[PDB]
Amino acid sequence: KRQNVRTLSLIVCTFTYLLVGAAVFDALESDHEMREEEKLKAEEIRIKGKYNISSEDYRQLELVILQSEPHRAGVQWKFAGSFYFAITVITTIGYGHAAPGTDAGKAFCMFYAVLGIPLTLVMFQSLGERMNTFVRYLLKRIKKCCGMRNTDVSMENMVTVGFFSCMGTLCIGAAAFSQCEEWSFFHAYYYCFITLTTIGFGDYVALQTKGALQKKPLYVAFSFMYILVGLTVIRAFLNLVVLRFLTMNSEDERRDAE
Amino acid sequence: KRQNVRTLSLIVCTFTYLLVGAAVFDALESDHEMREEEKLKAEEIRIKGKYNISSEDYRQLELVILQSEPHRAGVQWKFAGSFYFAITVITTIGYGHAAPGTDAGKAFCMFYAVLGIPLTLVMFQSLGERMNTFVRYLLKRIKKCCGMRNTDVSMENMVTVGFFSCMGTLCIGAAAFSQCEEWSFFHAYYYCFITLTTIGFGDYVALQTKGALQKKPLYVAFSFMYILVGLTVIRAFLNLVVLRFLTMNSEDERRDAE
Numbered sequence: 306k307r308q309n310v311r312t313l314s315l316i317v318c319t320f321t322y323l324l325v326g327a328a329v330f331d332a333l334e335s336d337h338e339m340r341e342e343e344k345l346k347a348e349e350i351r352i353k354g355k356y357n358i359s360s361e362d363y364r365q366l367e368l369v370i371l372q373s374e375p376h377r378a379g380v381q382w383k384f385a386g387s388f389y390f391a392i393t394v395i396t397t398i399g400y401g402h403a404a405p406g407t408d409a410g411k412a413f414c415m416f417y418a419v420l421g422i423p424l425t426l427v428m429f430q431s432l433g434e435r436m437n438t439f440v441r442y443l444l445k446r447i448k449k450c451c452g453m454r455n456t457d458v459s460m461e462n463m464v465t466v467g468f469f470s471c472m473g474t475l476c477i478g479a480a481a482f483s484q485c486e487e488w489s490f491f492h493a494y495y496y497c498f499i500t501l502t503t504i505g506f507g508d509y510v511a512l513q514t515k516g517a518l519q520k521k522p523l524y525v526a527f528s529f530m531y532i533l534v535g536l537t538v539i540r541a542f543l544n545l546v547v548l549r550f551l552t553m554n555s556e557d558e559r560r561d562a563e
Numbered sequence: 564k565r566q567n568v569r570t571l572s573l574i575v576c577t578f579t580y581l582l583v584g585a586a587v588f589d590a591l592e593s594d595h596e597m598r599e600e601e602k603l604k605a606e607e608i609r610i611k612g613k614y615n616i617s618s619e620d621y622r623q624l625e626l627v628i629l630q631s632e633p634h635r636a637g638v639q640w641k642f643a644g645s646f647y648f649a650i651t652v653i654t655t656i657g658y659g660h661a662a663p664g665t666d667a668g669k670a671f672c673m674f675y676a677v678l679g680i681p682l683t684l685v686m687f688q689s690l691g692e693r694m695n696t697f698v699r700y701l702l703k704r705i706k707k708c709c710g711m712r713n714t715d716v717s718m719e720n721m722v723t724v725g726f727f728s729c730m731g732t733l734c735i736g737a738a739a740f741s742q743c744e745e746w747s748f749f750h751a752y753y754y755c756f757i758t759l760t761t762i763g764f765g766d767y768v769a770l771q772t773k774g775a776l777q778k779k780p781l782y783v784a785f786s787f788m789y790i791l792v793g794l795t796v797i798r799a800f801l802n803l804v805v806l807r808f809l810t811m812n813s814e815d816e817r818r819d820a821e
């Protein structure tokens with residue numbers, strides 16, 4: 306039974322959390338959307354009237370301008386941008402700054418992700434375990450060197466070091482990207498958070514503001530290795546925190562054989 | 564040691580898989596991109612020359628048309644669209660069809676995701692365990708009713724039923740969305756795959772082709788419950804397959820105390 310009371314509690318929690326989220330996002334964003342849509346509609350009418358642009362030409366121009374936006378960021382599918390795409394696929398960040406235009410590319414993206422996502426999960430899990438083991442050794446050595454009465458490393462110490470490793474990773478990212486992309490520090494930090502949680506809205510995407518995929522190989526290398534290292538650190542902390550809970554239903558189901 | 568040979572093998576595998584992906588995506592997509600960019604640049608020059616649009620006006624018109632695209636899909640931040648956004652946040656699908664425009668909305672999106680992602684992972688893990696337990700009971704009852712010499716349910720049977728549950732979920736989604744959105748069956752299937760893996764490029768997004776968030780409450784309800792159920796089924800199968808491997812490094816590290 307207890308497994309069922311737990312799962313029903315988690316479902317009621319998730320739907321309550323969605324309702325609270327929806328109400329707060331509505332409260333924060335709904336007036337800004339309306340004022341922005343009134344401003345955009347006014348400027349649209351202004352320009353369309355100035356040049357007397359025909360409705361069919363304006364529709365075609367909208368289609369052209371929307372489809373041209375992936376191409377303004379330079380060549381996406383040559384090797385560097387194909388590698389950037391593959392990273393966003395198998396990590397499931399999926400910015401969608403470019404996404405495959407052909408049906409063959411779509412089918413390959415599916416078969417590629419089918420094997421790439423498991424491989425990447427097992428890889429980040431193994432690197433996270435190695436990282437946490439190194440941290441626990443290094444903390445034990447520090448505690449011994451500090452002469453503490455016990456060298457033992459408790460879960461609260463691991464959670465403290467995990468939290469400051471995540472904050473440090475996001476601050477280092479925010480500094481690098483706010484320098485390289487000319488974002489504000491807050492927007493670069495938001496970009497780093499949305500990337501390393503793998504949400505990946507793609508409102509902000511690095512390497513796109515110029516021909517940087519072609520022209521800045523060292524910044525491309527940084528962006529790729531920052532993504533892979535940051536995802537490792539964030540997942541290692543997430544696993545450290547939630548692993549006690551992910552296994553409860555199966556532990557109770559095994560004990561229920563008694 | 565064996566833990567280290569495993570993690571180094573997984574890193575070399577991941578980078579080889581990225582190189583193979585990048586080379587194949589380049590081979591598939593790079594000629595289509597160039598032919599499309601030549602067509603778009605030609606149509607841009609055509610329209611800009613027909614109306615003699617000034618360069619500054621064309622830049623402003625591009626900005627207007629790009630920022631107007633979220634608003635063409637109807638009101639995003641009223642309750643139904645705020646709920647759709649919150650779903651894409653805490654599941655980490657993150658289509659980015661709408662993303663918070665204010666800095667307050669960005670900060671809340673961060674604090675909201677910090678708690679929402681763990682909660683949702685623990686919820687899908689618990690529902691997946693309950694689902695797999697139900698399946699294993701139901702298969703045992705079927706085998707007993709079929710009069711088989713043993714009622715035991717092997718891992719190959721669970722993997723077979725998991726695979727056909729995932730294929731069935733994607734086919735049901737592809738049929739519903741190809742009917743409701745006027746996509747082809749292949750594009751609706753690609754959309755379902757990219758959604759339930761949580762990649763979420765957002766090239767295809769349901770509920771956006773008209774005022775459907777406001778005008779079609781029953782299709783909004785279907786889309787939300789399809790997302791939550793599909794993510795449950797897909798994660799339950801992924802866990803079933805990879806759980807033997809996710810725990811190897813910690814099992815070896817525990818046994819290494821001997």
Ligand SMILES: CC(C)CCC[C@@H](C)[C@H]1CC[C@H]2[C@@H]3CC=C4C[C@@H](OC(=O)CCC(=O)O)CC[C@]4(C)[C@H]3CC[C@]12C
Pocket residue numbers: 383384385386388518519522523525526527529530574
């Ligand atoms: C830490 C260990 C275990 C792995 C280290 C791997 C890195 C040294 C590799 C992984 C991916 C590589 C990058 C993959 C792609 C590119 C793009 C490449 O630029 C181009 O190819 C230009 C575009 C073109 O001509 O197609 C320059 C090298 C670079 C940055 C590579 C630099 C070296 C990187 C970062």
Ligand SMILES: CC(C)CCC[C@@H](C)[C@H]1CC[C@H]2[C@@H]3CC=C4C[C@@H](OC(=O)CCC(=O)O)CC[C@]4(C)[C@H]3CC[C@]12C
Pocket residue numbers: 419420423424427565568569572573576801804805808
């Ligand atoms: C979800 C379905 C459709 C696909 C599931 C694929 C996984 C089950 C595969 C994909 C990549 C595989 C991994 C790729 C490489 C390795 C390293 C390999 O390491 C060694 O053999 C090192 C020597 C040793 O450990 O003794 C062990 C298996 C493992 C973890 C594999 C285990 C099985 C994985 C996770």
Ligand SMILES: CC(C)CCC[C@@H](C)[C@H]1CC[C@H]2[C@@H]3CC=C4C[C@@H](OC(=O)CCC(=O)O)CC[C@]4(C)[C@H]3CC[C@]12C
Pocket residue numbers: 477481485520521522523524525527
């Ligand atoms: C504080 C310590 C303990 C950890 C963090 C160290 C940082 C200060 C380092 C780590 C990696 C470094 C980055 C590695 C690569 C690049 C790309 C580089 O890009 C260019 O030079 C652009 C031109 C080109 O790529 O050709 C600019 C510096 C930067 C961001 C570096 C800035 C300093 C960083 C963030």
Ligand SMILES: CC(C)CCC[C@@H](C)[C@H]1CC[C@H]2[C@@H]3CC=C4C[C@@H](OC(=O)CCC(=O)O)CC[C@]4(C)[C@H]3CC[C@]12C
Pocket residue numbers: 316641642643644646776777780781783784785787788
């Ligand atoms: C299976 C059990 C455990 C949970 C079942 C939950 C569903 C019955 C709920 C969850 C989310 C609900 C939806 C959340 C939001 C909306 C939008 C709402 O439309 C509007 O509010 C219009 C826009 C506006 O006026 O703000 C209509 C109901 C609907 C589809 C809800 C229908 C009922 C749903 C699918």
Ligand SMILES: CC(C)CCC[C@@H](C)[C@H]1CC[C@H]2[C@@H]3CC=C4C[C@@H](OC(=O)CCC(=O)O)CC[C@]4(C)[C@H]3CC[C@]12C
Pocket residue numbers: 307310311314315318543546547550677678681682685
């Ligand atoms: C990553 C950091 C920043 C945040 C980590 C948050 C998690 C540790 C929290 C978020 C939601 C929590 C869950 C919300 C609800 C429940 C149901 C609750 O169920 C009951 O109490 C039912 C009665 C019983 O089981 O006896 C058990 C704890 C649990 C799984 C919680 C465990 C801890 C969770 C996963």
Ligand SMILES: CC(C)CCC[C@@H](C)[C@H]1CC[C@H]2[C@@H]3CC=C4C[C@@H](OC(=O)CCC(=O)O)CC[C@]4(C)[C@H]3CC[C@]12C
Pocket residue numbers: 735739743778779780781782783785
């Ligand atoms: C094959 C069996 C074992 C499992 C799958 C059953 C399907 C045939 C059902 C399950 C849920 C159904 C869907 C639930 C809700 C809707 C929304 C509904 O939308 C409208 O009617 C639009 C107008 C409005 O919403 O007001 C159209 C039917 C549809 C897609 C249904 C089509 C048939 C579906 C996919």
Ligand SMILES: [K+]
Pocket residue numbers: 399400401505506507657658659763764765
């Ligand atoms: K996206």
Ligand SMILES: [K+]
Pocket residue numbers: 396397398502503504654655656760761762
């Ligand atoms: K994701």
Ligand SMILES: [K+]
Pocket residue numbers: 397398399503504505655656657761762763
């Ligand atoms: K995503």
